[PDB]
Amino acid sequence: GHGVEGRNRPSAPLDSQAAAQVASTLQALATPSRLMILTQLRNGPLPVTDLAEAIGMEQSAVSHQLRVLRNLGLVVGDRAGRSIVYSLYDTHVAQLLDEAIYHSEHLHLGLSDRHPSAG
Amino acid sequence: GHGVEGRNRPSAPLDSQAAAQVASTLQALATPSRLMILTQLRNGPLPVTDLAEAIGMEQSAVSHQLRVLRNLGLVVGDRAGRSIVYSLYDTHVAQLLDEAIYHSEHLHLGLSDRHPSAG
Helix, strand or coil, X not given: CCCCCCCCCCCCCCHHHHHHHHHHHHHHHCCHHHHHHHHHHHHCCCCHHHHXXXXXXXXXXXXXXXXXXXXXXXXXXXXXXXXXXXXXXXXXHHHHHHHHHHHHHHCCCCCCCCCCCCC | CCXXXXXXXXXXXXXXHHHHHHHHHHHHHCCHHHHHHHHHHHHCCCXXXXXXXXXXXXXXXXXXXXXXXXXXXXXXXXXECCEEEEEECCHHHHHHHHHHHHHHHHCXXXXXXXXXXXX
């Protein structure tokens, strides 16, 4: 019987933790393929069959991807009879993406010149 | 003589590209250690000697870290006599971090229960 304590006047959080925590968030959110799928949903709700038609037969990879993220959260799915809708847990992530994508899509501060094979 | 074309009525950008591009941004920004250092600077300008004192003798790792990011940008350094100040290229990244950090620090939607060794 470990027991519980609930709230204990929590305050003054660690620093290294916030970094690590954020790292994981900014890490997962990353992933090229993951973003592509996320962006698709960002547009609006849609079934796996639709997401596949847009890409090209990948409804299976979608169901699996969402399932994984579902366990970790960040995303949620709504079961409806013989149809399951997959969407983001909340607009939070969306808002962050909107700022990053918008600010990034705005101009082109970052550049990547074709590096030589020797490099 | 490859030549140049400059602007050519650019529009309708690719999708897979935006995802990959963002992935790199959200990927680099990640990194626990990198965030810790970034957060420190986010607070305000400061020399390596000061950054080390805050951590514990790591002014060298800082100079190298900034140097790397410096080549890729995202960050900028201002040389001043016998003192160099390292800071973020712009507030852009800062703004994005503010939203993510603030939204994340707000509550605790994401959770990570101690998984079993068998897992």
